[PDB]
Amino acid sequence: RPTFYRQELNKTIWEVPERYQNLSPVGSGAYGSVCAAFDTKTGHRVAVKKLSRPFQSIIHAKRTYRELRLLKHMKHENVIGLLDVFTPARSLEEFNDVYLVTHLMGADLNNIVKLTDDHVQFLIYQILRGLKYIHSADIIHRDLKPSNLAVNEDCELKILDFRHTDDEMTGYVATRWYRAPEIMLNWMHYNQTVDIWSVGCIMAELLTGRTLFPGTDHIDQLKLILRLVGTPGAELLKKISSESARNYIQSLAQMPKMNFANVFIGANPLAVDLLEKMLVLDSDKRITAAQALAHAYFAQYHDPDDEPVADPYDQSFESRDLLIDEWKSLTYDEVISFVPPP
Ligand SMILES: Cc1ccc(OCC(=O)N2CC[NH+](C)CC2)cc1
Ligand SMILES: Cc1ccc(OCC(=O)N2CC[NH+](C)CC2)cc1
Ligand SMILES: [Cl-]
Ligand SMILES: [Cl-]
Ligand SMILES: [Cl-]
Ligand SMILES: [Cl-]
């Protein structure tokens, strides 16, 4: 066990191993607080997050366990990984606080977004390489958007930030602009094809410099989507499971899918083709991450021997009913069993 030292930064007590020096606040919120630091053991600049109220309810305790399980599993060049996890507690009985450590990330895609076609190829390639890995473990990201994609000075990219309130999704908000239409109004339960819809929205924005579907509310956004990709046809309508969805969509005048070469004027024809394959209304028919990596748009970067899959991820805990102290003990076990990367 390392020696810990204490300090107060912006009215919060931080107790961390001596290896972490020069802590300085970088943000806070309902989730907790985050500090940048220098890790003297690895020489990396790091982000240290202290969770707030990690075991305040059953929902909160299960969410703390879920985050730690997901971060401990991720081991891929284009996905955030866990450098360390610690608690100052010496026993389960005095266990209360959890701290998570990752590489300190600089810019996100929001800040970067002059993007040439070569830049778009490399950025979207890396997103899809990371998504092939995530999806191979049967993990769904569910919230892909530019602020959740970190990028360094050499255009290298990592996916991060794997529930949002109803108020957070209301109105003219980027928190909703990248969501697939089948989940935006809860017509359907999540499945991994929703992440490919988000990639299409992000890729379009990198090519044009503009949000693809900047709706002022859920209904406005659906109308923007259906104008581009068309109203549902006979084949898809037959498959729609929600009755209130069926009835509302049938109230809209029918519209054909637009010509994407006239929407994305001047773009690489291979980029237009890939966008037509991601932005399909019927989610069954969307291209997958593994299929997209082999599309000719990525000819300069595709290497089928260097696009790895993930170890299996057991999420049977998601359907388990446990008490707060049982979720807390499971979390404690995962803290003390952590093994750092080489
Ligand atoms: C060391 C570390 C580990 C995991 C982290 O997760 C990001 C996070 O907590 N949030 C980012 C997105 N905000 C909406 C809420 C806060 C952050 C730092
Ligand atoms: C056959 C082909 C290959 C790559 C392409 O990328 C777009 C491009 O190079 N442009 C530069 C000139 N701008 C006016 C529009 C964007 C476009 C066509
Ligand atoms: Cl130490
Ligand atoms: Cl990382
Ligand atoms: Cl503690
Ligand atoms: Cl597992």
Best mutation site among 39, 48, 49, 147 for ligand 1 pocket (most ligand atoms within 8 Å of CB)? 49
Residues serving a catalytic function are 161
Total residue length of the chain? 342
CB 45 within 8 A of CB 37: yes
What residues pack around ion ligand 6 (CB closer than 5 A)?
313-314
Query: Ligand 4 is a single-atom ion; what residues have CB below 5 A from it?
Result: 81, 103
CA 192, distance to chain mean position in Å, is 12
Which residues contact residue 279 at a Cβ distance below 8 angstroms, ignoring those fewer than 6 apart?
A: 197, 200, 201, 204, 228, 229
Write the DSSP assignment of 174-225 as a string of letters: HHHHTS-HHHHTTSS---THHHHHHHHHHHHHHHHSS-S---SSHHHHHHHH
Which residues 6+ apart lie within 8 Å of 70 measured at CB?
139, 162
How much distance in Å is there from the Cα of 228 to the middle of ligand 3? 56
Report in angstroms the alpha-carbon separations of 154 from 5, 52, 67, 107, 160. 36, 34, 29, 11, 18
Contact partners, residue 202, CB within 8 Å, separation at least 6 = 109, 124, 127, 144, 145, 146, 149, 178
Six token digits for residue 30 = 């309902």
187, 190, 194, 188: which is closest to 245 by C-alpha? Answer: 187
**Distance separating alpha carbons of residues 150 and 204, to the nearest angstrom:** 18
Rounded to 5 degrees, φ, ψ at 84 are -160, 160
| Cβ atoms 258, 227 nearer than 8 A | yes
CA 184 from centre of chain: 16
Here the tokens at position 121 are 């190829």
Which helix (H) or strand (E) element contains residue 84?
A: strand 84-86
Residue whose CA is at the smallest distance from ligand 1 atom 11:
161
Cβ atoms < 10 Å from Cβ of 270: 15
- Look at residues 177, 206, 155, 196 and name the one whose alpha carbon lies nearest to residue 290: 196
What's the burial of 213, exposed, middle or buried (CB within 10 Å: 0-12/13-18/19+)? buried
CA 83/CA 271 separation, integer angstroms:
36
How far is 102 from 100, CA to CA, in rounded Å?
7
Task: Give yes or no for a contact between 80 and 102, defined as CB atoms under 8 angstroms apart.
Answer: yes
Ligand 1, residue 27: give the atom nearest the CA: 16
**Cα-trace Rg, the chain:** 22
Domain that holds residue 126: 107-298
The helix-helix angle for 269-278 and 193-208 (nearest 10°) equals 150
The ligand with the least distance to the CA atom of 51 is 1
**Which CA distances in Å does 142 have to 27, 51, 151, 193?**
23, 22, 20, 10
Residue ranges of the binding site for ATP: 26-34, 49
CA 80 to ligand 4 centroid distance, Å: 4
CA dihedral sign of residues 265, 108, 128, 289: negative
- The three-class DSSP label of residue 16 is strand
Q: Return the residue whose CA atom lies nearest to atom 13 of ligand 2.
A: 266
Resolution of the structure in the document, Å: 1.5
3-state SS class at 119? helix
CA–centroid distance, residue 100 to ligand 1 (Å)? 9
- Other Cβ atoms less than 10 A from the Cβ of 235: the count is 10
Q: Please identify, by atom number, the ligand 1 atom nearest to the C-alpha of residue 67.
A: 4
Question: Which of 16, 28, 34 most suits a substitution to test ligand 1, by most atoms within 8 Å of the C-beta?
Answer: 34
Give CA–CA dist 246/192, Å, rounded. Answer: 22
Q: Which residues line ligand 1 (CB under 6 A)?
A: 29, 31, 34, 47-49, 100-102, 161
Q: Going by C-beta distance under 8 Å and a sequence separation of 6 or more, which residues neighbour residue 95?
A: 87, 89, 328, 332
φ/ψ (deg, to 5) at 46: -130, 160
DSSP 1: -
Are the C-beta atoms of residues 282 and 240 closer than 8 Å to each other? no
Ligand 2, residues 115, 117, 208: which to mutate, most atoms within 8 A of Cβ?
A: 117
Q: Are 26 and 36 in contact (CB under 8 A)?
A: yes
- Which listed ligand is nearest to 99 at the C-alpha? 1
Residue position matching structure tokens 């969501």: 179
List residues bridging with 248 in a β-sheet.
none
Question: Quick one: tokens of 303?
Answer: 């290497």
d(Cα 155, Cα 301) in Å, to the nearest integer?
A: 13
Q: Which CATH number belongs to the domain containing residue 117 in this structure? A: 1.10.510.10
Which residues have beta carbons under 5 A from ligand 3 (an ion)?
2, 17-19
* Breaks in the chain (C–N > 2.5 Å) following residue: 113, 162
Ligand 2 shell residues, CB under 6 Å: 117, 266-269
9 token code pair:
């930064």
Atom of ligand 2 nearest to the CA of 265: 15
Q: Which two tokens stand for residue 5?
A: 């030292």
Helices 324-336, 58-73: crossing angle, 10 deg rounding:
20
Per the CB < 8 A criterion, the answer to whether 225 and 257 are in contact is no
